[PDB]
Design an enzyme around this catalytic site. Structure first.
Site, PDB file in Angstrom:
ATOM      1  N   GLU A 128       0.868  -1.206   0.000  1.00  0.00           N
ATOM      2  CA  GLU A 128       0.000   0.000   0.000  1.00  0.00           C
ATOM      3  C   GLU A 128       0.902   1.252   0.000  1.00  0.00           C
ATOM      4  OE1 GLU A 128      -3.231   0.110  -0.399  1.00  0.00           O
ATOM      5  OE2 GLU A 128      -3.760  -1.986  -0.132  1.00  0.00           O
TER       6      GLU A 128
ATOM      7  N   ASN B 133      -7.417   9.047  -5.723  1.00  0.00           N
ATOM      8  CA  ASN B 133      -8.306   8.119  -6.489  1.00  0.00           C
ATOM      9  C   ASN B 133      -9.206   8.963  -7.403  1.00  0.00           C
ATOM     10  OD1 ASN B 133      -8.354   6.245  -3.551  1.00  0.00           O
ATOM     11  ND2 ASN B 133      -7.660   5.328  -5.459  1.00  0.00           N
TER      12      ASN B 133
ATOM     13  N   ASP C 175     -12.476   9.123  -7.890  1.00  0.00           N
ATOM     14  CA  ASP C 175     -13.777   9.529  -7.295  1.00  0.00           C
ATOM     15  C   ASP C 175     -13.553  10.811  -6.479  1.00  0.00           C
ATOM     16  OD1 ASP C 175     -12.653   8.492  -4.869  1.00  0.00           O
ATOM     17  OD2 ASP C 175     -13.392   6.491  -5.360  1.00  0.00           O
TER      18      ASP C 175
ATOM     19  N   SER D  42     -11.468  11.068  -3.905  1.00  0.00           N
ATOM     20  CA  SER D  42     -10.960  10.631  -2.583  1.00  0.00           C
ATOM     21  C   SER D  42      -9.448  10.472  -2.661  1.00  0.00           C
ATOM     22  CB  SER D  42     -11.618   9.362  -2.138  1.00  0.00           C
ATOM     23  OG  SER D  42     -11.151   8.244  -2.872  1.00  0.00           O
TER      24      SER D  42
ATOM     25  N   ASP E 283      -6.101   8.247  -0.576  1.00  0.00           N
ATOM     26  CA  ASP E 283      -5.590   7.241   0.375  1.00  0.00           C
ATOM     27  C   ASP E 283      -4.370   7.809   1.111  1.00  0.00           C
ATOM     28  OD1 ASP E 283      -7.574   5.404  -0.574  1.00  0.00           O
ATOM     29  OD2 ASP E 283      -6.103   4.437  -1.951  1.00  0.00           O
TER      30      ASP E 283
ATOM     31  N   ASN F  49      -8.797   5.601   3.301  1.00  0.00           N
ATOM     32  CA  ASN F  49      -9.536   6.336   2.250  1.00  0.00           C
ATOM     33  C   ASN F  49     -10.330   7.469   2.884  1.00  0.00           C
ATOM     34  OD1 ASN F  49     -12.234   6.429   0.211  1.00  0.00           O
ATOM     35  ND2 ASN F  49     -10.227   6.504  -0.739  1.00  0.00           N
TER      36      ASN F  49
ATOM     37  N   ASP G  34     -15.416  -4.095   8.851  1.00  0.00           N
ATOM     38  CA  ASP G  34     -16.556  -3.445   8.144  1.00  0.00           C
ATOM     39  C   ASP G  34     -17.229  -4.370   7.128  1.00  0.00           C
ATOM     40  OD1 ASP G  34     -18.127  -1.155   8.068  1.00  0.00           O
ATOM     41  OD2 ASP G  34     -17.200  -0.481   6.151  1.00  0.00           O
TER      42      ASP G  34
END
Length: 129
Positions: A35, A46, A48, A50, A52, A59, A101
């Site tokens: 990562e 990203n 959209d 967003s 990281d 996120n 989650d």
């Protein structure tokens, strides 16, 4: 901060990631490696809108507030800057919510692609834990 492998491993174990929701410490070290390359300041945009953030690339759409992600919910109740700290405490606490989650470590797309189903125990070799 760039961590060494066993350096990160020791910290992740102190904060309780070893076997957390049935995922061995090797899964967590492997996830951090791919990562973030163990770089607590890693950020990746990203498409959209967003971003990281940090050692576990958390996120900004659901997990932390960077104040510039449409439809953001800040479920970890922290600014995304806190996930770029040299200490991993916040990143771990928040990662414990994310892995709980409903998709386990499948939330981490580098973990899924490079760690899942592999010999993850190799990631804690030479570490004196």
């Amino acid at each position: 901060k760039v961590f060494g492998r066993c350096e990160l491993a020791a910290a992740m174990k102190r904060h309780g990631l070893d076997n957390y929701r049935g995922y061995s410490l090797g899964n967590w070290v492997c996830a951090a490696k791919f990562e973030s390359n163990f770089n607590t300041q890693a950020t990746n945009r990203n498409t959209d809108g967003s971003t990281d953030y940090g050692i576990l690339q958390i996120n900004s759409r659901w997990w932390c507030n960077d104040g510039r992600t449409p439809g953001s919910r800040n479920l970890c109740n922290i600014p995304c800057s806190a996930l770029l700290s040299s200490d991993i405490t916040a990143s771990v606490n928040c990662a414990k919510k994310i892995v709980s989650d409903g998709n386990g470590m499948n939330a981490w797309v580098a973990w899924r692609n490079r760690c899942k189903g592999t010999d993850v125990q190799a990631w804690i070799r030479g570490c004196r834990l």
